[PDB]
């Protein structure tokens, strides 16, 4: 159960746009920290309308279940504000934000070894979730958060976290799932009840395609109906220009869910590209 944060300890400063049925803000939380020190902590606030009850329950149950598994590559949620007509997730503010925007802002001037390190870190997060049999269900580059940039002097790589899962595709409207092709796997387009650990292997492949493509969105030129035809004709994504990960992408985006490799196997594969 999330720690309850009082509305009077939350300051909303900047509107940052929308997620899927969420409104996003930057703000500050006033809190008591270690040694009793009084802090004003930068937070990322995700607002859900309590009138969308099924969506809010799904969102917060997913955030809560993943925050029960503390891990270096999983986002920190500080708690929640049951804030009148809205329920608000109070999350850590990750300094460099979403990875797809970061890669665009850096004009894909990122070397393959950087991409390999981020891919390995996500794979280790996903292996942890797999070992815990916890489905994330919305793995994508917008949900990879860059804590720190590479530091060439120390040799330290970039460091990422995986963000909260959001509303489950088992409750979302079908038209939203189709818009989310090719992150949502073919079996879930056929029936959202096919959500499974295998779902995250597919979406991991799509996310590696994003990373290798400098934050482009696959199939962006296709409307929903052509995205369904993509899957009907069982096509595979084009190799990214950073084609070093094309084989892994295709191996994870296997139309047969039971053939998608374990994250332990994915990590070994990534290591062998060094
Ligand atoms: C540089 C910068 C700019 C904006 C936000 C951050 N920090 C951040 N921290 C967290 N925890 N999560 C996210 C993604 S939330 C989302 N969904 C839809 C839109 N936005 C913004 N960004 C950093």
UniProtKB/Swiss-Prot annotation:
Q: Which cysteines are joined by disulfide bonds?
A: none
Instruction: Report the residue ranges that make up the Protein kinase domain in this protein.
Output: 10-274
Which residues does this entry mark as bearing Phosphotyrosine?
35
- On the tree of life, the source organism's domain of life is Eukaryota
Quote the PTM field.
Autophosphorylated, leading to regulate its activity. Also phosphorylated by TEC. Phosphorylated on tyrosine residues in response to interferon gamma signaling. Phosphorylated on tyrosine residues in response to a signaling cascade that is activated by increased cellular retinol.
Which tissue types show expression of this protein?
Ubiquitously expressed throughout most tissues.
- Record site: Breakpoint for translocation to form PCM1-JAK2 fusion protein: 175-176
Cellular location(s): Endomembrane system; Cytoplasm; Nucleus
Q: Which family does it belong to?
A: Belongs to the protein kinase superfamily. Tyr protein kinase family. JAK subfamily.
Q: What do we know about how this protein assembles, alone or with others?
A: Interacts with EPOR, LYN, SIRPA, SH2B1 and TEC. Interacts with IL23R. Interacts with SKB1. Interacts with STAM2. Interacts with IFNGR2 (via intracellular domain). Interacts with LEPR (Isoform B). Interacts with HSP90AB1; promotes functional activation in a heat shock-dependent manner. Interacts with STRA6. Interacts with RHEX; this interaction occurs in a erythropoietin (EPO)-dependent manner. Interacts with ASB2; the interaction targets JAK2 for Notch-induced proteasomal degradation. Interacts with MPL/TPOR.
Tell me the function of this protein: Non-receptor tyrosine kinase involved in various processes such as cell growth, development, differentiation or histone modifications. Mediates essential signaling events in both innate and adaptive immunity. In the cytoplasm, plays a pivotal role in signal transduction via its association with type I receptors such as growth hormone (GHR), prolactin (PRLR), leptin (LEPR), erythropoietin (EPOR), thrombopoietin receptor (MPL/TPOR); or type II receptors including IFN-alpha, IFN-beta, IFN-gamma and multiple interleukins.
Q: What is known of its domains?
A: Possesses 2 protein kinase domains. The second one probably contains the catalytic domain, while the presence of slight differences suggest a different role for protein kinase 1.
Instruction: Quote the disease note of the record.
Output: Chromosomal aberrations involving JAK2 are found in both chronic and acute forms of eosinophilic, lymphoblastic and myeloid leukemia. Translocation t(8;9)(p22;p24) with PCM1 links the protein kinase domain of JAK2 to the major portion of PCM1. Translocation t(9;12)(p24;p13) with ETV6.
Q: What is this protein called?
A: Tyrosine-protein kinase JAK2
Source organism of this protein record: Homo sapiens (Human)
Identify the gene encoding this protein.
Answer: JAK2
Please tell me where this chain falls within the complete protein, as first and last residue plus total length: 536 to 809 of 1132
């Amino acid at each position: 159960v999330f720690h309850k944060i009082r509305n009077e300890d939350l300051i909303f400063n900047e509107s940052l746009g929308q997620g899927t049925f969420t409104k996003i803000f930057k703000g500050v939380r006033r809190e008591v920290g270690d040694y009793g020190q009084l802090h004003e902590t930068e937070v990322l606030l995700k607002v859900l309308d309590k009138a969308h009850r099924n969506y809010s329950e799904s969102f917060f149950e997913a955030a809560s279940m993943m925050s029960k598994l503390s891990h270096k590559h999983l986002v920190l949620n500080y708690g929640v504000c049951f804030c009148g007509d809205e329920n608000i997730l109070v999350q850590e503010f990750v300094k460099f934000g979403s990875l797809d925007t970061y890669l665009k802002k850096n004009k894909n001037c990122i070397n393959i070894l950087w991409k390999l390190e981020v891919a390995k870190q996500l794979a280790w997060a996903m292996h942890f979730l797999e070992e815990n049999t916890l489905i994330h269900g919305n793995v994508c580059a917008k949900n990879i958060l860059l804590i720190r940039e590479e530091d060439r002097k120390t040799g330290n790589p970039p460091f990422i976290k995986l963000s909260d899962p959001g509303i489950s595709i088992t409750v979302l409207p079908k038209d939203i799932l189709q818009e989310r092709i090719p992150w949502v796997p073919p079996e879930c387009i056929e029936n959202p009840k096919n959500l499974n650990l295998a779902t995250d292997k597919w979406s991991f492949g799509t996310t590696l395609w994003e990373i290798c493509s400098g934050g482009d969105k696959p199939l962006s030129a296709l409307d929903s109906q052509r995205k369904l035809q993509f899957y009907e004709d069982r096509h595979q994504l084009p190799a990214p220009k950073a084609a070093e990960l094309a084989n892994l992408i295709n191996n994870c985006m296997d139309y047969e869910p039971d053939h998608r490799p374990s994250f332990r196997a994915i990590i070994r594969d990534l290591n062998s590209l060094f």
